[PDB]
Amino acid sequence: LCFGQCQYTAEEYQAIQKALRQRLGPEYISSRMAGGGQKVCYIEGHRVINLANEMFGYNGWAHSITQQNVDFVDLNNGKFYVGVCAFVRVQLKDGSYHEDVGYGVSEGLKSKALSLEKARKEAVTDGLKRALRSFGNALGNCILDKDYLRSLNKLPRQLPLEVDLTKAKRQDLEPSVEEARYNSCR
Amino acid sequence: LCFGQCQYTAEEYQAIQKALRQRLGPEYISSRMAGGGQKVCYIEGHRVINLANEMFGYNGWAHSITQQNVDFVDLNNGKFYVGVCAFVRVQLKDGSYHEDVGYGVSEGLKSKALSLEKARKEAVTDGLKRALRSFGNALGNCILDKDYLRSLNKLPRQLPLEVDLTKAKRQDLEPSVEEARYNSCR
Amino acid sequence: LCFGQCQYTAEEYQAIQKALRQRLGPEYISSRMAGGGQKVCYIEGHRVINLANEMFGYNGWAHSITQQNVDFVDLNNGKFYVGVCAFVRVQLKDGSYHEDVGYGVSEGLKSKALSLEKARKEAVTDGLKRALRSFGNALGNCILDKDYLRSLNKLPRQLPLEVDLTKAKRQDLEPSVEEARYNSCR
Amino acid sequence: LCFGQCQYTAEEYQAIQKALRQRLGPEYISSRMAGGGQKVCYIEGHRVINLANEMFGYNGWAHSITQQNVDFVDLNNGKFYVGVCAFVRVQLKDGSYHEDVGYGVSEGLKSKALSLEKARKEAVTDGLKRALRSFGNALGNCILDKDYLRSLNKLPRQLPLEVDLTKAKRQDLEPSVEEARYNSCR
Amino acid sequence: LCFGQCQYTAEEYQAIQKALRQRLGPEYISSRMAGGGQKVCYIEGHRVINLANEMFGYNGWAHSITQQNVDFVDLNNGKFYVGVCAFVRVQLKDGSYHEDVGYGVSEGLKSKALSLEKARKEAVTDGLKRALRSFGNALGNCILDKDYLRSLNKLPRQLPLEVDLTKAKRQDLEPSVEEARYNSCR
Amino acid sequence: LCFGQCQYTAEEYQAIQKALRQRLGPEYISSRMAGGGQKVCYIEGHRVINLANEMFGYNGWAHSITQQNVDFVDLNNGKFYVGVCAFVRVQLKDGSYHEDVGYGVSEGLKSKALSLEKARKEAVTDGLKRALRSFGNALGNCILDKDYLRSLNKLPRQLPLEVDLTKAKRQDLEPSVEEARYNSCR
Amino acid sequence: LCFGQCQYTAEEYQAIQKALRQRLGPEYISSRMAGGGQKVCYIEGHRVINLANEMFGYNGWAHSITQQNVDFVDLNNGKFYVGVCAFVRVQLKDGSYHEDVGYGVSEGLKSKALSLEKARKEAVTDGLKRALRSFGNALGNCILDKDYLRSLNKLPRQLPLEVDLTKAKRQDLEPSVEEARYNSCR
Amino acid sequence: LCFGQCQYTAEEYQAIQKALRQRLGPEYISSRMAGGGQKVCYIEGHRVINLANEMFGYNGWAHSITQQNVDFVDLNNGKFYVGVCAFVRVQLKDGSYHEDVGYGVSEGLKSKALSLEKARKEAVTDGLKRALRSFGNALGNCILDKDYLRSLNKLPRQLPLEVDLTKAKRQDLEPSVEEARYNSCR
Amino acid sequence: LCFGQCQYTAEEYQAIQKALRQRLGPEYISSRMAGGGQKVCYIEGHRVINLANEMFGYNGWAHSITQQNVDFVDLNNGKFYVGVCAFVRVQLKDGSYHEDVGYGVSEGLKSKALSLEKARKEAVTDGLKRALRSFGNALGNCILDKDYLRSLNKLPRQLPLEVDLTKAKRQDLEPSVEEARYNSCR
Amino acid sequence: LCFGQCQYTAEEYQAIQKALRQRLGPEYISSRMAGGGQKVCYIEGHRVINLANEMFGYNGWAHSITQQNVDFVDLNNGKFYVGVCAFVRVQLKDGSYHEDVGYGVSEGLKSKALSLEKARKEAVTDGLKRALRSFGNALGNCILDKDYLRSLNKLPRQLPLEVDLTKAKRQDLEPSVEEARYNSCR
Amino acid sequence: LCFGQCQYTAEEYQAIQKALRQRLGPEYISSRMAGGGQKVCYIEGHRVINLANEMFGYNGWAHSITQQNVDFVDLNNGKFYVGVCAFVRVQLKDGSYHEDVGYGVSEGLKSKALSLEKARKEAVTDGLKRALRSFGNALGNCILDKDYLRSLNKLPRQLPLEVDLTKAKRQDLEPSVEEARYNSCR
DSSP, rough: OOOOOOOOHHHHHHHHHHHOOOOOOOTTTTEETTTTTTTEEEEOHHHHHHHHHHHOOOEEEEEEEEEEEEEEEEESSSSEEEEEEEEEEEEEETSSSEEEEEEEEEEEEEHHHHHHHHHHHHHHHHHHHHHHHHHHHHHTTGOOHHHHHHHHHOOOOOOOOOOOGGOOOOSSOOHHHHHHHHTTTT | OOOOOOOHHHHHHHHHHHHHHHOOOOEEEEEOOOOOOOOOEHHHHHHHHHHHHEEEOOEEEEEEEEEEEEEEESSSSSEEEEEEEEEEEEETTTOOEEEEEEEEEEEESSSSSHHHHHHHHHHHHHHHHHHHHOOOOGGGGGGGGGHHHHHTTTTTOOOOOOOOOTTOBOOOHHHHHHHHHHHTTT | TTOOOOOHHHEEEEEHHHHHHOOTTTTTEEEOOOOOOOEEEOOOOOHHHHHHHHHOTTTTTEEEEEEEEEEEESSSSSSEEEEEEEEEEETTTTTEEEEEEEEEEEEEESSSSHHHHHHHHHHHHHHHHHEEEOOOGGGGGGOOOOOHHHHHHTTTOOOOOOOOTTTTTTTSSOHHHHHHHHHHOO | OTTOOOOHHHHHHHHHHHHOOBBBBBEEEEEEEEEEEEEHHHHHHHHHHHHHHHOTTEEEEEEEEEEEEEEEEEESSEHHHHHEEEEEEETTTTTEEEOOOOOEEEESSHHHHHHHHHHHHHHHHHHHHHHHHHHHHGTTTTGHHHHHHHHTSSSOOOOOOOOOTTTOOOOOOOOHHHHHHHHTOO | OOOOOOOOOHHHHHHHHHHHOOOOOOOHHHHHHHSSEEEEEEEEEEEEEHHHHHHHHHTTTEEEEEEEEEEEEESSSEEEEEEEEEEEEEEEEEEEEEEEEEEEESSSSSSSSHHHHHHHHHHHHHHHHHHTTOOGGGGGGGGHHHHHHHHTTOOOOOOOOOOGGGGGGGSSSSHHHHHHHHHOOO | OTTTTOOOOHHHHHHHHHHOOOOOOOEEEEEEEEETOOOOEOOOHHHHHHHHHHHHHTTTTEEEEEEEEEEEEEEEESEEEEEEEEEEEEEESSSSSSEEEEEEEEEESSSSHHHHHHHHHHHHHHHHHHHHHHOOOOGTTTTGGGHHHHHHHHOOOOOOOOOOTOOBOOOOOHHHHHHHHOOOOO | EEEEOOOOOHHHHHHHHHHOOOOOOOTTEEEOOTTSSSSEEEOOOHHHHHHHHHHHHHEEEEEEEEEEEEEEEEEEESSEEEEEEEEEEETTTTTTTEEEEEEEEEEEEEEEHHHHHHHHHHHHHHHHHHHHTTOGGGGTTGGGGGHHHHHSSSSSSOOOOOOTTOOOOOOSSHHHHHHHHHHTOO | OOTTTTOOOOHHHHHHHHHHHHHHHHHEEEEEEESOOOEEEOOOHHHHHHHHHHHHHHEEEEEEEEEEEEEEEEEESSSSEEEEEEEEEEEEETSOOOEEEEEEEEEEEEEEHHHHHHHHHHHHHHHHHHHHTTTGGTTTTGGOHEEEEHHHHTTTOHHHOOOOOSOOOOOOHHHHHHHHHHTTTE | OOTTTOOHHHHHHHHHHHHOOOBOOOTTTTEEETTTTTEEEEEEEEHHHHHHHHOOOOTEEEEEEEHHHHHHEEEEESEEEEEEEEEEEEETTTTTTEEEEEEEESSSOOOOHHHHHHHHHHHHHHHHHHHTOOOOOOGTTTTOOOOHHHHHTTTTTOOOOOOOTTTTTSSOOOOHHHHHHHHHTT | OOOTTTOOOOOHHHHHHHHHHHOOOOOTTEEEEHHHHHHHHEEEEHHHHHHHHHHHHHHEEEEEEEEEEEEEEEESSSSEEEEEEEEEEEEEETTTTTEEEEEEOOOSOOOOOHHHHHHHHHHHHHHHHHHHHOGGGGGGGGGOOOOHHHHTSSSSOOOOOOOOTTTBOOOSSEEEEEHHHHHHHO | OTTTTOOOHHHHHHHHHHHHHHOTTTTEEEEEEEEOOOOOEEEEEEHHHHHHHHOOOTTTTTEEEEEEEEEEEEEEESEEEEEEEEEEEEEEETTTTEEEEEEEEEOSSSHHHHHHHHHHHHHHHHHHHHHHHHOOOGTTHHHOOOOHHHHHHHSSOOOOOOOOTTTBOSOOOOOOHHHHHHOOOO
């Protein structure tokens, strides 16, 4: 009854089906400037990872890199141009799964190492994000829907939120977790 | 009783068989201009993803990339011409499946990276969409039926639909979900 | 008791054996002009897909591409000549199966990308259609029977039959399916 | 108890052993002119497929292409000469099987694509037909028996038979089948 | 209890052990002229196939091509010289088996295609026949026994029997089989 | 309890152990002239096959070609010199087995095809014979024993026995077997 | 019930889901100067290792290197420039898992060996750290969240921590451990 | 309870353990002249085979050629020099086993084919003999023991025992074998 | 219930979780001079090995070399420069595991053999040590923590303590062991 | 309960443990002259084989050649220099095992074939001996112990013992053996 | 319950854990002169083998060569320089295991064969010793501990004790071993 062999209970299946339908608020979306001097919306990897963890549980989803391929490493002046693709397969405790390609780009740096590093890492993250979109709007599928983007723009400018470090983990030991783990062995 | 080993109950099977027969409304179909100065109808990936999730459940269908091949990367001026194909296999919790090819194209950009990226991604999405058509009209099989297209044109315009974020997910935490999941490990 | 492991019940077996014998009416057959200035009859992919879904159930048949091979890509003027083959294996929930080759051709376009895309996609569809013919007339085995073709010509033409979009699907939500699904978790 | 794991019941076994012994009437045999200006008898693929379906049931036999190899593609004027072989393995629900080679030829066309297409497709159908012969006369084993051919000639003009499409399938929906199917999940 | 897993009952085993010992009559043997202007006796493939089907049942034996290799394709004038070998494995429902080589030859034709076609097909049939010999005289093992050949010559000639086509099959349907089948899904 | 999984009963084991010890009479041995102008004794393949079938039952032994390799094809005048080896594995219903090499030679023919054919076939038969020798004298192990050969020579010649084609098979149909097989389905 | 086959009890699952949400205090975060003269925050591998051990138990998580590839080793003066990537898969006792790429860089050393050593080691640790981030904020996912970084800066520098070696392990022997062990082979 | 899965009964184990200890008499040993003009003793393959069959039963030992490699084929005048090695693995019904190398040599013949044939066959037989030696003196292990050879020489010359072909096999049939084996199906 | 399939008992798990947290005393730490004229602390392999044996039991942990690769062997004067890496995977009886890279270096020796030997052996040990660190401070995870190193320096330099060889194993025989082992077969 | 799956009984285990400790007497050790004009002690393969058979039973130990590699074949005058290595794995009925390398050398012969043959065969035997040494002194582990060699020299002349061929093997047949066998079939 | 599947009983486990902690006396350690004119201590392979056999039982540990690679064979004068590495994996009846590299060196000999032989054999033994060290001091882990070495030197010489060959084995047969072996099959 380990990962890949669970079957969702009607209650968890139903809760998730509904939750996945939600589109995400402005607090999730960020943007950058495309070469064409045009806005590009996207969700940052860390937000997607937390959405996934909260949607399926830290132990309810997984991902692996089926393959990563460096498309090219070009030196055209004193600078490097690098294109990398990754194929990421994400899976639920269910055994259900989705796979997609992510692409990573680095153009202009003078460091070969730094260029490769950027491109390889972004390809994986980009792939993880695209694979996860398959589960629904709440995991990013709304993101490329022009009507969603449009109605997002008609929303209030929004101030970045302050993070409250008051209750941040401040040491390794996890008392409650240790308690549970010791009772589990029984 | 995990993914790939379910067997549809008579009730779910019957409901789905019927639902799949439906053709989709104008709110799903979009179009672009082909090189021959001719309209081409298609369904955006995100719509197909949601159609699938609602038809089979977020844990009812899955897809993998059996293979992706870059056919060519030509530089014919200062611009790149790229053709990529992807073979996508989609499967139901049932074990039933359909596989098809998708193609991705990028012609005219000056960025090799941006060209490869566009082509690889679209090939995958295109392949996922074609594989899914095999299940029925509701998943896209009507889309290339000239009589369906014809009768779609005999409809009033279609204006951009408005998305309402009044109840957009703004926090990660899904209480209902956590409850259902908490009640499942016992 | 998943896909590939079912055994047909005598009742379903018998109904299908019979239904498969039927030849198809004019409403399925379409035609194009061969190079030799000669009529060529065929069934469009989407019709075959629906025939299959109705004959076996959306979860009663499946298909995969065992292999797709690009035979050649020739540039003989400013135009491309492309030949592609696909091997498609279709299978029933039974485990029974048939495999065939399909071919895809593109001659004359100036776009390499567009040529490759056309040829790869048609090879697959063509192969799917040929593999499916093996199950019987109702799935297209009649199509190449000259006596059938002959007696088809001796029938009244058949103007494009309009499509009834009043009952079209316009939202992703499928309430009946959603209910039956909940009752299946049980 | 799926395909490949059935065992024939004494009754079905016996009926088939007998039925397979029959030689086929003139209505099955067709002929063409060999290069040596000599008659060559053969059965059209579509007839063989129907013989097979009726003999074993749509779910009683299967076939796959173990391999297809293009022997050569020669351009000797402005025309193409192509030879292709296919190895086809046909199997019964029994697990019993037979495998043979089929060959496909195209000589004289100016289209490479059309030539490859013709040769690859015929190789498969030819292989399928030869593999099937192994089961008995009723599936084509008589066809190359000179004494059978001889006594076939000593018969009238097997004058073109008519194909009656009164009862031709005009829709996708199969009511008797749907009923049978929906009850199979009980 | 499918193919490859049956065990012969004492009764069937014994009947077959005996039947296999028989040498075959003149009605099976045919001959051709070897290059050395010398008679060569052999059994035609179709006879061997029927011997096998009657000896073991249409579902009691099977064969596969473990491999086919084209040894050479020589053009020495305007004619082709082709040598092809095939390894054929035949098996009983028992699991018992025998494998042998078959060879195919085509010397003198001007068609490469026709030469390859002839050699490949004959290699397979030749291999199937040699493999089958291993089971006994009744399946051809006598054929190369000079004392058998000698005493065959000391026999009156025979007029190739006329095939009684009165009862020839002229229809696909086999109501006999179709019922034996129906009462097996039960 | 299929081939490869039987265990010999004490009775059969004992009978065979004893029978295998027998040396074979003059009626089995034949000879040819070695290049050194010296007699070479050997058993003809068809005799060995029958010895095997009678010793173990048609379903009691089997053999496969683990590998066949063409050592060389030399043209040294207008003639061909060919050496071929085959590795043959023979097995009993027991699971017990023996494997050996067989060699095939063809020197002097002007036909490449005929040379290859001869060498390939003889390598296999030769290998099958050498493998079978391992089971005992009755299967050929005596054949290379100089003391056995010597005492074979000290015998009066013996005229070719005649093949009693009285009761030779003149039909396929074998009611005997067919009748038992019909009761071996219950 | 070994590693990879456990299933989290509801109590441990819940405790860990909660614990993983925590962001980490200043005591975890360290920083270095990027080439762009800009601060880069990160967590040291040894802290991440302890975080993981305390969160899941020393036997609750694992990691393997699916692959490590040296991208390049360039000598551009008397100095080496090295880029290495590692794919690290971490897994819980659950069977759940996440995989990511890590990169290792060495620029400027004159020792090839020292350069390779630094890059291969950092690539692995970097990858382990990135893979672990997928489980939640508590394992590092907060680290790249600009709002978290921002609110981390609005805190007083912290003086260096003194470690207390008072109770440091001074012998290899672990008595309490040896007991427990010994009472388990029962 | 087939080959490879038997376990020796205490009685058979004991009998064989003892029997294997015996050194073999002069009637087994033969010799030839080494190049160094020195005697070389050896046992002929056929004797070893019979020793094995009598020691373990025809179904008590087996052997296979794990690999055969032709080391070289040199033509140094008009003659051929060939060296071949074979790896032979022999096994008991027990599952126990021993494997060794055998070498085959042919120096001086003018026939390439005859040279290869001699070397390949001897390598196998030589290997089989060396592998069998591992079981004990009775199977050849004494053969290279100088003290055994020495005391063998101190024996009377010996006339090669006469081969009594009285009861020699003249029939394929084996009524007691066919008897037992007919009852084993019961 | 062999290695890789145990499950820690709550008692052993708990003891180890705790023991692993300890940092190690000065008696474990040693140092060398880095090229930059800077101190480098490390733990000697043998200490690590004993820490592991005592922490998990001689039969509680294991390690294997997944791969070892020689990066380069350079001769730049009369001296050799060698870089080698090893990937070591350590596992607990649990099935839990951790893998890391180790590196081995040899710069300056004149012996190629001695250089390779040093580099290959250190790579393995280095890897084994790094993999083991993943389990906790007690196994080395503290070692690279600057605050730990710092507070280690503030200790009274430690005097290289003596080894008491009095009770040193002087023979191979192991009494209590041989007894305990003898009984385990009961 | 076949080879590789037995478990030693306490009694057999204990007897063997003790027996293995014995060093072997002068009757086992032989010697040759090393190139350095120095004595080299060793045990002859046939003695080792018998030691093994008596220690574990003819069915208690096994060995296979995991690999044999020819290091070189040099011709430096008119003579050949050959080095060959073999990896031999020996196993007990237990499943326990040891593997080692053996080396084979042939320097000076003028025959390539004879050189290869000597080196290949010795490598195997040498490997078998080294592998077996791992089990204990009784199987050869003492042989390289200088203190054992030294105290062996202080023992008198080892006049070759006499092999009393009295009750040697004269026939193939083995009655007692054959009797247990007919009784083990029960 | 064969090798690799035993579980140590608490009693054997405990005895071994304790025995493994012992450092070894002077009677185990030997030394040689390193090129740097410096003493190098080590244990001879045969001592290690016996230590192992006595610690775990002849059937309690095993080892295999996962791989052996020859790094180089250099000829720099008339002498050979050879470096060889071996990867040895040792395992307990437990399933627990440890793997390490061993290196073999040969510098200066004029015989290529003798050089390769020395390096390959030492690499294996060296690897076996290093692998074994992982189990504890008693198997060699102390050997490289400078404080142990130091306190070993502070001892008295020790005359290489005399080996007492009184009860040295002179026969093969082992009566008790053999008695137990006859009683086990029961």
